[PDB]
Symmetry: D2
Subunit: 494 residues, 4 copies
């Protein structure tokens, strides 16, 4: 029961947000944001650069000064504001979902029912954390009273991707604001619209000036300025593994700012012989094709047991063929276009590489429409570990199906990767599910399900998939600076 | 690697332990402790009563006074002391195990490899908690600094049973001492020897006088004196449901002392049709016959699915018949005698009741030896829920086997009880295990195993099986008195 | 900033609330609720009894059944509902404040600014806890996977007093609902109106029927029925020490339900010679006279160091004489009438007692008005520890000022009591504050302030002032039933 | 009481420790370790390089493989091993202390009473944590069972300094092993002896081969090899800010391994006018001169209020002049030599800079002996914020005394630094203590004391003094990898 969308929502925000005010780039330059479904320019957006980031960092630092409104505000009140923001986002839920679909390309139905719902749930979850992340009173040796204060890390720089514009912003702002930090956010050049509007709601909610500053623009410019800035205390990044390296190096070369990364992946989805066929097939399909295949934890390595391989592949091909591709604003559309031309060509390149390396193309493999960046749901069979499409993150509607024999075998092959963001296991057997979930080297292991996110459960990667965790209580750790206070007392007693 | 047992160890301790000194009862009266395997008197033991308890409490209260050695002692040092106690208990391991078997009746091998090992692991586990149960610093509203202090509850009265003399003593002392409390322990009249010897080790370990006081005696006298004492801050009890009511009533009638109970049970052991036959049989046998069936969490209700009922019963009867009953000091003995004549007659009474109520006697059902309190491994088939032997805790080697058809059926029948201490589920199916583990109303739900205790995991019951939890981190809660300190500050900041 | 009150608010709810519906007592009996300011009957209210309690318990038990809307509901949604209730209460804030003052007698300004504000903050705080009270995954020994489930305790019976009707209801519902429990609340016969209206808001908020049931009536009847009920899993009570004993005894004599108590006190307020005089005097006054002296943690023992005694007393007498007593609906009124005739007589009795035992009457000591139950702000000087007015809780506007010399002395005198709910220390010295905060045996120790309650900070008493803690994270413990699930795994690995 | 030391202890270990075996450098090269008291070479030590590091990493990785003795070992047993290692270090306490003094230069009395005691306390503290760092069971939305596994981060590369050879090793091993990780440690070229002997004790303790690997050698070679290694999962470093940057960049350039740093500092020690003169002076002296001034948290900026400045300086000078310098093995020696020639010259250079920039030399300022690296206790008065000695970490016996007027002023001046390791406040006033401890931007704030370390309390720096925290429960975070397991269930219930 989704409300009828406005297939052409008006844009009210397209500038740089600093101190609750809208500013044009110091250079007065602007960059175009394109609708991936048409290829046409939606509107111009202020191209923030280093000079702009410097204005944002100063605003943030000022808002973080001891004695300031944001610093003196009750922890509970910080929770009140987060809930207020969530309320305002829900009020403009219909509009934001449409604007999200317009700039990202994802189906409006999914934007409304999934993205916006998770955004609301994330902000409201962390709202409750605002006055509960307690410090500790420590029974240290000697005549002393020792305790820890959980203080805000400070000026936090947050660089987010384009796959989940609104959700990524919520995942970042939620924990940062709940812990009393200030933010300088750098949204993706491909999807800056929705984030900018939320900035308007952040002001409306009552958040003090400088607490949240958003600087739209390119990565090598605005993004790098934040990562290398001398007054940024912490940086959180979500994107490619390549840029993650640049971020951590920039942090080490600058002021040694704290860093947390959420990189890509090549998550394995293991389907045992005793799995519920119909369920496993549908979930495997969702596991990879969700959000145009543009998901960090996408099940891009579908391992299927030999005895059920053939039937599984058959059912998967059928499901992939019936997957409706088209205008994201039409309720029947299951898959919209890719985010941009760059990703569009990169995905086609991977498909071409899959053909060249001996992967058996089962369906799709080409452009789905003349206008826009639409790609057909592609499925590759008989994929081998050594193949490129089996190692590199495609980030598109390209499924890889591999065959295995033993449970010991699949573990080693699944773990044979530089990534380790997520993993899945489909089976009815207790011991098998427990053996695999423990053995698999991944941040999140789903059993008989996939892409099950909850603001209560932490999400992060192993190995080169990133470091640190987001969501849940763990999501507060990276946004907290621990201070130990040890006081001399006349005589310590238990 | 079980050392040769001294089949008649020397008794060095048989008096009341107060202020690290041995005292006779104020009345000079004594009571005999009997060897269950022979029925002969081992030795006399001081019969502590109210006046003796009053002395112990005063000693405890004094050792708990602010500024005393026990109160000023560093938390970490409290851990060192618990570790020292452990080492001393291990030094005299062989002796303790033998003395345990002599007074209790349980097999020497079991006392050594099971009971004493667990005792060591319990004290060592809690030793590590001594300086880790932190308080909190709370981000309260307004210009204040609020924090909590986790202080000792105070004088702790601990009344334990006879089924696991040494282990029950450790389960109580470990958390109590780790949190800096003082103890006035009332051991079972049937098995006071081993506990009294440990008191010697406690003194040798370096623990300040008054910190741990042991008063051997009867329940209506010494036990009630503790539960009704006006200066006892908290009381922990383990035994029958009947006395548990008396304890709670006494606490409410006296000074409203904090209370935690670990009562009996009629724990169900559910064997699904897809379970590992051999494993389930051996575990179900162990689940009920362990420690002469004198276990609080004994699986006295063995639910078996109809499709595998016949075979399971057959195998169970065979195992029950092969269970070696005899002298506990003999390496071949698997089942020793019952703790005493009262229990001996009570068990036989239940067996006679099982026969009169229509339960099918498959094997055993009578006295296993002329001398001592030995009973044959009895197994009843086609047991119905309404049967006495299916509702009341027998606490003996009397197995009950019930048949069921559906999973929804077994859950309802398993939960239909005033008890809820523990339960078990044997199956290879993931969903079945998860369904039953969540639906069963019990403190502990074992999956494909039984009687799996770990100092790391909490143990306690639902409904009338008790309140509160022992073992694990949870075991510290009842021994902690929380104090909030809210201080006015010049200006509160995050 | 306080909206003009409706001095004669309309009563819309006066029956028994069960399954989201209003019912008359099965006996059809009703009892009058009196306005303490005029002594006139406000209206009649359904007199609930045992049969009515049975109906409520059955409704709550049904709503708690596995698979019910309340049990299946997402933890996050539980928080959503609590947040909704809070919003509804704030909407009807002006109304509830007036109704609270009408039935209780406390100043309308206080009802609006303090009571209702604290109610909103309590419900909102606990709303955030709904999906954050995590269980644990334990690294148990052997090849096992052990974890704990934090399940609801079940059918919770809550008996609240009359000194803070709305607030006491929130302190009870907040933690109970946040943890998924069901409630059968028995409000005070003197102040049932506000709680009943809130029940209307509970239904409006969307809470499933049976989740919260309110039964207005007397103690020996309705209250006892809850405490003795065989199907009530836990009971929380707040009131007199005498009734607290009856409650714990009833629990032990019935089904061994879990019990937490919040009783009275004789809280000591220590004023050191180096304290801020003007601040200590005003705070010492507030500490005692707040809410007509009807506060559990009222500073009924004001200890003042000799060197500043005379000046402190002189200023305290002046402040007490300037305390405006009168119509609680008038903005100038500081002190309204006592809750009822019974309390009125009880306080007058204590005042006479103080005069008879040698306490020096410095001001007041008699009836403040002809109509209603108004008593003059009374101050006793040169009070000694042995005097009855120094040991027993008066619960009225009667201040006791005692003199002391050293800090070691005052600690001993302040701790020499069967009560230990709260205490305070007024001093500028760091060491003195830490020495006293540690030494005082009280649940809450305020430093340079008093009556500072925060939903984030736990509240409860030591000794006979109660057991267990309310508010903060600790407030969730008593409403949680811990379940351990130990699963056998193929091979356990770190 | 201190046992008579062997001024010339025998060296038993001087090679590379891998797989519990001693290996020579692959290149067969060795480096000399010098006795700072005489300048003479103690012995040659295997100069480990990249090739030796690779051998170590592979050994650790192998020992970390699923199903290995280290991975399958019960968490409780891991604590048993740490406790055992601690018992062995205590047995060889006298020897270790002597060898520590011989290689480092610190007084034997200090090494025995301070360093070794803290080492024993650190390892025993973490020993208790081994089986207590629980994961969580999360009440996520929908029909799912979500929980987190707290697994070991993996192969941990640890690089430690020379100021506290044994203690630094303990601070690293304790948390790493308690959580089940494997270590590749690179000790300081200046102090490799004691660490290597401990490795021998690690083997004797029963630790599996490959669990702990120690590779002695230089920084740019062995240290850089660990930081840039492709198979090292996490790196912990303690040393200069300069190398900290190198380590962070090396980690980002390689496999994006998790990084935590503990760098230098310019810790401010604020003495208010109301402080206890005698105590403040003695503590300020200790704050800076401890361990030859070679302490990361050394109070290198002594802020003293003008009203007491003159008297404070006078007393400090007298104390510095009386500080006995000489043979570290002599019981009367308070200050030994500096670690090496490099530091010796560096400190002498800073002293020269202090004179050049206008700082008032009050005492010392030159070489204290003809043989060895001894420096006279130097004190500079009237130091200004802009002076080099007031900004850069000297790491020697050079004290800086600065004068201030107001508390607001000292807060700003104290926080005006790129460092933020620790700070201290000396005052008798409660408000000032709380105001400053909250305002000071430092990882550890001491009140009326200094250098109070406790294994229970976290230690780490703000800003450029490092990231993350060591000691206490927080010290376990960096050595844990969080995995979320979300299982689909039939029907979720609270
Ligand atoms: N983990 C994830 O969910 C995401 C993964 N990716 C992966 O990365 C591939 C390429 O897509 P991109 O848009 O280029 O991802 P990216 O990691 O390069 O860019 C993402 C964010 O980082 C910013 N950025 C770019 N260069 C930067 C720099 N030098 N310093 C600081 N920030 C910088 C971008 O402007 C955007 O805000 C995708 O095909 C997919 O494989 C992309 C987005 C998200
Ligand atoms: Mg890029
Ligand atoms: Mg009995
Ligand atoms: Mg009454
Ligand atoms: Mg260097
Ligand atoms: Na776009
Ligand atoms: Na006996
Ligand atoms: Na009334
Ligand atoms: Na050296």
């Amino acid at each position: 029961a989704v409300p009828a969308p406005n297939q052409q929502p008006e844009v009210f925000c397209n500038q740089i947000f600093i101190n609750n005010e809208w500013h044009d780039a110091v250079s007065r330059k602007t960059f175009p944001t394109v609708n991936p479904s048409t290829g046409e320019v939606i509107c111009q957006v202020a191209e923030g650069d280093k000079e702009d980031v410097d204005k944002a960092v100063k605003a943030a630092r000022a808002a973080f000064q001891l004695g300031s409104p944001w610093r003196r505000m009750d922890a509970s009140h910080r929770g009140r504001l987060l809930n207020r923001l969530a309320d305002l986002i829900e009020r403009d839920r219909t509009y934001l979902a449409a604007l999200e679909t317009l700039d990202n390309g994802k189906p409006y139905v999914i934007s409304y029912l999934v993205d916006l719902d998770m955004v609301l749930k994330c902000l409201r979850y962390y709202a409750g954390w605002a006055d509960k992340y307690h410090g500790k009173t420590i029974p240290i040796d000697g005549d002393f009273f020792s305790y820890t204060r959980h203080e805000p890390v400070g000026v936090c720089g947050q660089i987010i991707p384009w796959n989940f514009p609104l959700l990524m912003q919520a995942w970042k702002l939620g924990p940062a604001l709940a812990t009393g930090n200030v933010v300088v956010m750098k949204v993706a050049e491909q999807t800056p619209l929705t984030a900018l509007y939320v900035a308007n709601l952040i002001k409306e909610a009552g958040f003090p000036p400088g607490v949240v500053n958003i600087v739209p623009g390119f990565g090598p410019t605005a993004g790098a300025a934040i990562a290398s800035h001398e007054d940024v205390d912490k940086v959180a990044f979500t994107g490619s593994t390549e840029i993650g390296r640049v971020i951590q190096v920039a942090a080490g070369s600058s002021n040694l700012k704290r860093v947390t990364l959420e990189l890509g992946g090549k998550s394995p989805n293991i389907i045992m012989s005793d799995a519920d066929m119909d369920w496993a097939v549908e979930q495997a399909h969702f596991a990879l094709f969700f959000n145009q295949g543009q998901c960090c934890c996408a099940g891009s390595r579908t391992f299927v047991q030999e005895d059920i391989y053939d039937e599984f592949v058959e059912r998967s091909v059928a499901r992939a063929k019936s997957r409706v591709v088209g205008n994201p604003f039409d309720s029947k559309t299951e898959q919209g276009p890719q985010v941009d031309e760059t990703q569009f060509k990169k995905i086609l390149g991977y498909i071409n590489t899959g053909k060249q390396e001996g992967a058996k193309l089962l369906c799709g493999g080409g452009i789905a429409a003349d206008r826009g960046y639409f790609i057909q749901p592609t499925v590759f069979g008989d994929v081998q570990d050594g193949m490129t499409i089996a190692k590199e993150e495609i980030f598109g509607p390209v499924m890889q199906i591999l065959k295995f024999k033993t449970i010991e075998e699949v573990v080693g092959r699944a773990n044979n990767s530089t990534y380790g963001l997520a993993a899945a296991v489909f089976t009815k057997d207790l011991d098998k599910a427990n053996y695999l979930s423990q053995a698999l080297q991944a941040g999140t292991v789903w059993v008989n399900c996939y892409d099950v996110f909850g603001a209560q459960s932490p999400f992060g990667g192993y190995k080169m998939s990133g470091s640190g965790r987001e969501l849940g209580e763990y999501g507060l750790q990276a946004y907290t600076e621990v201070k130990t206070v040890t006081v001399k007392v006349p005589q310590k007693n238990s």
